[PDB]
Antibody, heavy 229, light 213 residues
Framework: VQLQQWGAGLLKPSETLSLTCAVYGESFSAFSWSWIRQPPGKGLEWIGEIDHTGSANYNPSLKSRISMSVDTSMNQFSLELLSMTVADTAVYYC??????????????????????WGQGTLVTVSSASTKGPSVFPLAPSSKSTSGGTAALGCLVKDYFPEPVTVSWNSGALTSGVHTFPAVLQSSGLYSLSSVVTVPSSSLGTQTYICNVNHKPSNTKVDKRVEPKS | EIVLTQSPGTLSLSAGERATLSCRASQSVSARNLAWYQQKPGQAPRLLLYGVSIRNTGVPDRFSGSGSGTDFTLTISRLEPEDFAVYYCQQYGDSPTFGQGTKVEIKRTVAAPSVFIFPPSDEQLKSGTASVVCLLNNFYPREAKVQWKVDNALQSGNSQESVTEQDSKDSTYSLSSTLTLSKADYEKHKVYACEVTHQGLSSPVTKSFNRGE
């Protein structure tokens, strides 16, 4: 069971937020589907849920701001959040909830515990416009070394907004990789760096390419990293 | 309506120790409608336990859940470095609510950073900006100091640093510092040095390069 979600990501203040989640798992009918948000460095907050029937329950605090919809033909469900504020900047998650049960004398949600989850969608509320990153190589010294290990990386500079996804050799090497949290520059544009430590011998023999993806600007960059020589 | 309070806020334990996580509810939780989640950095929460004590599929046996009514408890028998994460309790007796979370951190022996310094690329120099990056790799604990010296001159206010979370394998941190210069100023000086001070180092370690060498 797999959950994919796509969304605007960047929003001016007071605009509505619209996110859509696609369920490829099958068993779309079986369970309710929930939206849950997490502002950066804070706790999880349950927004609401819905059934292919389209019956839905919302968080009482966020009431009159929440709409949820279902597209049974495409196996999708969506979230609508009115009048966005910087307060609402968070990561919004797709999640499979509990079943919606209909009984003779009672109708309710049962076992409303969330599993599995989506990768999430970071929503930024700002008036600033989007901007694609520049990808620069962090070249290895090519020095004799007295140590087996060598370090190489990518510098992803000047982009907005968050986030950026960095991979190495299309996920072939994951060991010893470190992608640092982005830093907010004075310019107001985000920057980050991703590095990997490898055996020094492999520098000449093995090709190293980082794969930078910036979804909001739809920029996909592959940069070859080789010793300066 | 139902409020969940988690204690402690922060938990710092060595590997192999047993961890006790508490969850307190404003109202009784009906039946056994309680769930625990494990959230690792850069990742979506994963269901650990539901029904107070039922292990989710793929979950190690060291994780256990107990309690009822007002008091619930999650217990990790034998801690692992991969078990470093944030843990949330959730009730689904009523409309779903979460605890504020309890962060579990790993304690280990002191480790000294491996230091690398990276020159700005020729590609970037066309932009009219130079970024010099200093990498501090796999050191514990966190307190670390990075000095930028450009041609023997200490740099302040033109650098920023970024620290990773505790590593899944070895519980260590990694740090990156970026020194930002204009193309003009960068071409003026020869020696760019990165000086690292850390507990694991008996004496400060300095990595440097000569521009255009």
């Amino acid at each position: 069971v797999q959950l994919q979600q796509w969304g605007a990501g960047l929003l001016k203040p007071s605009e509505t937020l619209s996110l859509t989640c696609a369920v490829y798992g099958e068993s779309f009918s079986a369970f309710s589907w929930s939206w849950i948000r997490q502002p950066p460095g804070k706790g999880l907050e349950w927004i609401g849920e819905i059934d292919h029937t389209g019956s839905a329950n919302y968080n009482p605090s966020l009431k009159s701001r929440i709409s949820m919809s279902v597209d049974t033909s495409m196996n999708q469900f969506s979230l609508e959040l009115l009048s966005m504020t910087v307060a609402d900047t968070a990561v919004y998650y797709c999640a499979r909830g509990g079943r919606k049960v209909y009984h003779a004398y009672w109708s309710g949600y049962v076992n409303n515990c969330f599993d599995p989850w989506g990768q999430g969608t970071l929503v930024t509320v700002s008036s600033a416009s989007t901007k694609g990153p520049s990808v620069f190589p962090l070249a290895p010294s090519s020095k004799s070394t007295s140590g087996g290990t060598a370090a190489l990386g990518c510098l992803v500079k000047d982009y907005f907004p968050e986030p950026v996804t960095v991979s190495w050799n299309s996920g072939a090497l994951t060991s010893g990789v470190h992608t640092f949290p982005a830093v907010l520059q004075s310019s107001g544009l985000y920057s980050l760096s991703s590095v990997v430590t490898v055996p020094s011998s492999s520098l000449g023999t093995q090709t190293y390419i980082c794969n930078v993806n910036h979804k909001p600007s739809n920029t996909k960059v592959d940069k070859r990293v080789e010793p300066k020589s | 309506e139902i409020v969940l309070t988690q204690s402690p806020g922060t938990l710092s334990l060595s590997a192999g120790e047993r961890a006790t996580l508490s969850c307190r509810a404003s109202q009784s939780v009906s039946a056994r409608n309680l769930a625990w989640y494990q959230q690792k950095p850069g990742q979506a929460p994963r269901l650990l336990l539901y029904g107070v004590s039922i292990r989710n599929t793929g979950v190690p046996d060291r994780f256990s859940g107990s309690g009822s009514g007002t008091d619930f408890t999650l217990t990790i028998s034998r801690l692992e470095p991969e078990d470093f994460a944030v843990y949330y309790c959730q009730q689904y007796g009523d409309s779903p609510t979460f605890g504020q979370g309890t962060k579990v951190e790993i304690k280990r022996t002191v480790a000294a950073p491996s230091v690398f310094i990276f020159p700005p690329s020729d590609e970037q120099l066309k932009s009219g900006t130079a970024s010099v990056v200093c990498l501090l790799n796999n050191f514990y604990p966190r307190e670390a100091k990075v000095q930028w010296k450009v041609d023997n001159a200490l740099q302040s206010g033109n650098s920023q640093e970024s620290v990773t979370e505790q590593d899944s394998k070895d519980s260590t941190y990694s740090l990156s510092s970026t020194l930002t210069l204009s193309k003009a100023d960068y071409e003026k000086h020869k020696v760019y040095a990165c000086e690292v001070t850390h507990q694991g180092l008996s004496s400060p370690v300095t990595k440097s390069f000569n521009r255009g060498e």
